[PDB]
Design a binder for this molecule. Structure first.
Ligand SMILES: O=C(Nc1ccccc1)Nc1cccnc1
Length: 185
């Protein structure tokens, strides 16, 4: 792909983070803590899952960023509406305002309803995410495998401003402590 020149500098929004997340000083890395991180509750925080949003809001144009997923067993990545549900249980679907892919139990799936099997020969260590607001497109790229396409959501009905979306996943296994990291331009 040739989307690299739409690169945007994403930072994480602490106020949206689940209360167990640890976000680095530079707001470019996030991991699951082993306990509550001693923050006050608020209506923005994701309560049920280890999720956080980027601070940036997008309503036009073409945007591209990259995320490092090295050694993680489970995660979700993509974009979502600014007005997605924060509290309680919900599924990641375009009906609920999410355009995402994930790793879970050694398989990769796109967050359609119902979910779609992805075909990845080279497990990615870094994922590229491309949004074309006007075109209604969200695409995912395997940076480890020379930028090969993973998945394209097309005919997207964003219906609002978009924010970068992250889930570091639970760490019940003791094998999923590694962070998500926003990779440098
Ligand atoms: O896993 C960690 N580092 C890392 C992992 C993969 C790639 C790059 C860095 N950090 C960590 C985890 C648990 C407690 N303290 C620190």
């Amino acid at each position: 792909h040739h989307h690299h020149h739409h690169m945007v500098h994403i930072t994480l929004d602490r106020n949206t983070a689940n209360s167990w997340l640890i976000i680095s000083k530079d707001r470019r890395q996030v991991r699951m803590g082993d306990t509550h991180q001693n923050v006050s509750d608020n209506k923005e925080r994701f309560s049920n899952y280890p999720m956080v949003l980027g601070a940036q809001r997008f309503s036009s144009g073409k945007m591209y960023w990259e995320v490092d997923v090295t050694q993680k067993e489970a995660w979700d990545l993509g974009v979502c509406r600014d007005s997605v549900q924060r509290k309680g249980q919900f599924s990641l679907s375009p009906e609920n305002g999410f355009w995402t892919i994930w790793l879970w139990q050694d398989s990769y799936e796109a967050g359609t309803s119902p979910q779609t099997t992805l075909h990845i020969q080279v497990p990615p260590c870094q994922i590229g995410i491309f949004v074309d607001y006007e075109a209604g497109v969200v695409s995912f790229y395997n940076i480890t495998d020379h930028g090969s396409l993973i998945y394209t959501f097309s005919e997207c009905v964003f219906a609002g401003p978009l924010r970068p979306f992250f889930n570091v996943g639970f760490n019940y296994s003791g094998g999923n402590a590694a962070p998500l990291k926003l990779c440098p331009l």
